[PDB]
Structure formats: structure tokens, C-alpha cells
Amino acid sequence: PANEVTLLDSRSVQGELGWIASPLEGGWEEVSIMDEKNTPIRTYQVCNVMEPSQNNWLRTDWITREGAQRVYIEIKFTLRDCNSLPGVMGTCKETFNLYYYESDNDKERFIRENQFVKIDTIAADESFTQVDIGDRIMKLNTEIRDVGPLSKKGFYLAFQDVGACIALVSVRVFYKKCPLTVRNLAQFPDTITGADTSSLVEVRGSCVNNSEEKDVPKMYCGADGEWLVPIGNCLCNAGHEERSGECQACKIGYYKALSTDATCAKCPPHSYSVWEGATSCTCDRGFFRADNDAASMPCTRPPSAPLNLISNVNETSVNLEWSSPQNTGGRQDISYNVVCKKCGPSKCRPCGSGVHYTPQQNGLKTTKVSITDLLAHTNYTFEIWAVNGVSKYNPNPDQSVSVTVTTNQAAPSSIALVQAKEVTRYSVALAWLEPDRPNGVILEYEVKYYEKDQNERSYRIVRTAARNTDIKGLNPLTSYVFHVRARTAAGYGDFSEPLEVTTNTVPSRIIGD
Ligand SMILES: *[C@@H]1O[C@H](CO)[C@@H](O[C@@H]2O[C@H](CO)[C@@H](O)[C@H](O)[C@H]2NC(C)=O)[C@H](O)[C@H]1NC(C)=O
Ligand SMILES: *[C@@H]1O[C@H](CO)[C@@H](O)[C@H](O)[C@H]1NC(C)=O
Ligand SMILES: *[C@H]1O[C@H](CO)[C@@H](O)[C@H](O)[C@H]1NC(C)=O
């Protein structure tokens, strides 16, 4: 596996591994066993089970420990049951002994007779047998033992047969490491396991490119080569976000302003980021951000012109009313500034004075202002400007609309004749005269209507340029009241006397059928 590093494998070793036996003859014997396919595997067998005592040694070649302290030894072997051999009770054994000795000499010519250390007496437990199909062996035992802590450049493994009936099929020697990994944006290197089978090796992580440490990244390498639960983390730098084990630049159109931010966010309305790894979003053309700001908050724009600009005049005092613009851009910080003028295109200077202008004349949150005390018979002109937190960045006169007005201009008279031209079950067509004395240019007419009955009465308004209108979508057989008034730059005339019209049962020709 990725957590094991093989120091020796007898099955890999080609062509007579070869191993020192003592005695050289009559002890452990090398013989090749045939697998399913392909090549032979060198094994060692002895079954000297009729002898009173046996001491047969077999020793590997020198094995480097590399950097390992704790080394594992996996032995696969077969064992013939003493009971299956006739009359060998008392001589025959079911175990063999395993030893090692550490050495800096990789060239030892003879098996040592003293300095070895016993790893264990190895027994085969029957119930743990495996079927090995590859080498054609029905009952194979596998036992693993471990040694350490190892301090020298290498070591020799030795097998002592005391009188068993045994074939050593394979020997694999290895150490364990926790494999290279990335955890919480910190890299942890391949780490050789500790000195004992219980050891934990503390490893400090390194921040990946390109991120910064938040809390010191640390993780334990367990002796089984598994990492334990890490602590600490690194955070992706601004303009980057965690993907896989890496901090990758924010994708086009996306941004991350601070390292403490989780992931990349798409640029908010009317801002964009044209480069990867963006920490900011450039405002779109015609769009801005106020000094009081969040780069997460969308860019905004100066509003459109205020709507339904309506003038009323009384003597020298001009009262004005308007409505919120169609496009705020948008923000709720909108306010209005009024602009006075005197002309009658060229020149038209400010009319500068100490006038009011009540309540404000600038930075105004309401839709009304009353102007008082300016001079009497002259044409003035007003611009009402819709303002917001931006527009100091791009002021334009189309953030305002104008009304030309004449002071001391009288309001128009009332209408005094309004007629129902055609009545159907759902509609009333109206027509009316111009007022006797418009006293100026008529800008539009307003029809006001409602149900005669006060309960469930809804007041509605229709505006028109012409002197007629068709009021549609009404209740049938229902009594309604209509009034009309005209507007000029001097304001509204008084409404006409009420005209009462009851819808009838005449079919609608629009609906047909
Ligand atoms: C305010 O402006 C109006 C519109 O221009 C002026 O009315 C015009 O006056 C001239 C003569 O000065 C006439 O020839 C036009 O026929 C008028 N226009 C209209 C209403 O049709 C008015 O004179 C100006 N008043 C002041 C005091 O400047
Ligand atoms: C002018 O406006 C005020 C508003 O209350 C009103 O009292 C006064 O009657 C108006 N003048 C005329 C000519 O009616
Ligand atoms: C981070 O450093 C690596 C080398 O470790 C370098 O190759 C790379 O350019 C850096 N990351 C960026 C900005 O792509």
C-alpha cells in the first residue's frame, strides 16, 4: 500500500536470493516452487522431524533499514501437522523461531552464533489459513512480527528450525510511513512512523501556494501509517479559493476581497472583474460607489428625472409637486434640489435672493416645496433635480425635468359642461368643453370618477390631452359620478359640477359574441 515501503521481498528476488544456511546441507534446503504463472519462486524447506534435536539456521542477506525505526516482517509459510506424520510425537514441532541482529557490516560472511536477538517463536494458527491460488498452495499461513527501535544502517533476519515440517514460501520486510497529504490547505510530507507500535509522530504542516497560516497546522502520523485528526489551518489569499488541495485564483467574473472570506463570490450588480485572482470588482461604465462603501454592495447610478412635474401658482408664490423618478438606480438615499431662474434660452440669471423655498430648497426628502416672495409679473423657470449618494460623480440635467411658469398667472376657470356621449353596460364615453377662461395654455385634463354609493367607493383619475375619454371596465347597472378639470402652468381649475351617469344593459361591441 501507499503506507508501506518494502525493504526486502523474497518473491521479487531473482535467481537464488541467496541465503546462508547453517548447516549448509541437511538443514534448510532451497527449492523452486511453480506458480500459476509465470516465474519460479525460491523457497526453503526442511522436515527433519525424526531427529531428537534440530538447530537449522537460515539467514537473509543484509537489509538496509533506510530511515525506519520500526520494521515489520511478513512471513508466509506452510506447516505439516505432526499428527499427520507417523510416530513423530516428541521430536516433531509445530513452530519455528525468528531472530534478527542489527549491523553496519552489510558483508557478514557467516551466520552469527551469539549476538542475535529473538523476535518470537512463530506458531501457525489453523483458522487463519488462506488459499493462495497464484503459487498453487492450499493452506498458507501468514504471520507478521515487528522489531525495533532500529539504530544501525541495517540488519539480518534469521530463521531457526527446531524440528518442524516447514516450507518458507515468502518473506517480506517493510516499514510504515504516513503518505504525503494536504489537510486544511497545509501540506504534510511523507512521514516515517515512530519508534514503537504505539508511537505518534507530530508533524507541522506547510501552507500551500498561495495561502497564509491561520492557526499552526499540525497532525499526528500514527504507527499504522494513518494520519490522525489535524489541527490548525491555512487560508487562501485574497483573489483565491480552496479547490482540491490547492488555492486557485478566482474565476473570471468572480472575486474574493479578504482571506477570511470563505469562497469566491460572483461580482454584484454593475461591477465586474476582468482578471482572475481578482480582489475587487471594477464598477461598470456609468456606475459608481459612494465614499461610504462596500465592494460587496452593487454599484449604483444617478437617478432618472423626477416625474409628473406639476406647478401651482399663487400671486408671487409658486408651489410645486412631483413624483419619485422611474429609475432610482438604485438607492433609498434620494433627495431633491430646486433650481430657480428668470428669463423670457440665453442668459436667464439666478434671481439670487434670500427667498424661501420652505422647507429646504436642497437635500429634500419630500415631494413638495413651496416657493415664496419672488418678483411679480415675470417668466421664471424651475428645474427639480433628483439626487442620490452618487451623481456627484456624474451630474446631468436629465436627472431633472423643467416647468416654465409665469408669476401672477391666474388659474383656469371650471368646465361647466361635461357630457356622457355613449353609455354601455361596462363603459361611459365623456366629452367636455374647454374652460371659458383657460388663462394660459392647457397642458392636460383630469377626469375624476367614483361610484355614487359611498360604501365600496373607489376614487379614480384619468388624464388626457383631448377633450374626451372613454371610461371602461365599469360595473353594469351601476351609478357613477364624473368631474373634469383642466391644468395649466398656473395649476388646476376647480372641478366641474358632478355629472351622474348610470351604466345600462346595452351590449359591449368590443366584447361581441
Ligand atoms: C413669458 O413667455 C411667454 C411665452 O414666450 C410670452 O408670451 C409671448 O409673448 C410674445 C410677445 O412678447 C407673443 O408674441 C407670443 O405670442 C407669446 N406666447 C404665447 C403665450 O403664445 C410672455 O410674453 C412672457 N412673459 C414675460 C413677462 O416674460
Ligand atoms: C394663496 O395660497 C394660500 C394657501 O393657503 C391661500 O390661503 C390663498 O387664498 C391663495 N391666494 C388666492 C389668490 O386664492
Ligand atoms: C507560487 O509559488 C510557486 C512555486 O512554489 C510558483 O511556481 C507559482 O508561480 C506561485 N503561484 C502562482 C502565483 O501561480
Side-chain angles (χ1 to χ4, degrees), residues 336-352:
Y336 307 98
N337 309 333
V338 196
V339 186
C340 142
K341 286 173 57 186
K342 283 177 174 162
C343 45
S346 70
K347 307 309 192 130
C348 275
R349 264 196 83 261
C351 91

Side-chain angles (χ1 to χ4, degrees), residues 284-478:
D284 288 339
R285 193 193 164 179
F287 282 95
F288 310 93
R289 284 189 181 96
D291 238 70
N292 318 33
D293 198 328
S296 163
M297 294 190 183
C299 299
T300 47
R301 66 170 231 82
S304 61
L307 299 152
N308 320 340
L309 175 51
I310 289 172
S311 60
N312 164 271
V313 324
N314 188 317
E315 296 268 62
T316 51
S317 181
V318 169
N319 280 242
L320 204 141
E321 188 176 347
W322 65 93
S323 83
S324 160
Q326 176 171 1
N327 188 349
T328 185
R331 33 247 317 277
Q332 307 192 17
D333 65 351
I334 21 73
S335 99
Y336 307 98
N337 309 333
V338 196
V339 186
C340 142
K341 286 173 57 186
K342 283 177 174 162
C343 45
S346 70
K347 307 309 192 130
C348 275
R349 264 196 83 261
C351 91
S353 54
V355 302
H356 233 221
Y357 284 155
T358 121
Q360 267 72 43
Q361 199 240 359
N362 262 243
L364 191 51
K365 282 287 184 173
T366 20
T367 36
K368 294 179 180 49
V369 74
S370 291
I371 290 78
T372 50
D373 231 321
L374 45 78
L375 56 88
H377 276 76
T378 59
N379 296 336
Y380 283 58
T381 293
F382 284 77
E383 294 157 334
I384 280 68
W385 295 65
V387 203
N388 62 23
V390 299
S391 87
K392 60 174 182 169
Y393 296 147
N394 188 13
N396 190 292
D398 79 336
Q399 294 142 21
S400 77
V401 66
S402 297
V403 46
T404 304
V405 69
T406 291
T407 357
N408 302 319
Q409 180 181 357
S413 67
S414 71
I415 280 143
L417 186 64
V418 178
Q419 45 206 5
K421 286 316 191 186
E422 177 173 29
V423 183
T424 69
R425 59 184 57 178
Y426 313 131
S427 67
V428 173
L430 297 168
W432 53 90
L433 297 189
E434 208 177 302
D436 270 36
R437 295 101 59 198
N439 294 319
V441 178
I442 294 179
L443 305 178
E444 79 185 331
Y445 292 88
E446 195 176 296
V447 178
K448 178 185 198 166
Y449 80 88
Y450 53 90
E451 291 87 353
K452 178 69 172 308
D453 176 20
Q454 29 269 316
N455 301 333
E456 178 89 359
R457 167 187 280 187
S458 171
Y459 296 96
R460 293 91 118 188
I461 293 298
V462 178
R463 297 159 71 252
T464 181
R467 289 190 279 102
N468 49 80
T469 192
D470 188 27
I471 307 296
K472 295 184 284 297
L474 294 177
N475 301 12
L477 254 15
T478 294

Side-chain angles (χ1 to χ4, degrees), residues 179-192:
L180 164 112
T181 192
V182 168
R183 231 48 85 79
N184 299 334
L185 294 178
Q187 198 167 260
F188 302 76
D190 278 343
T191 299
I192 295 177

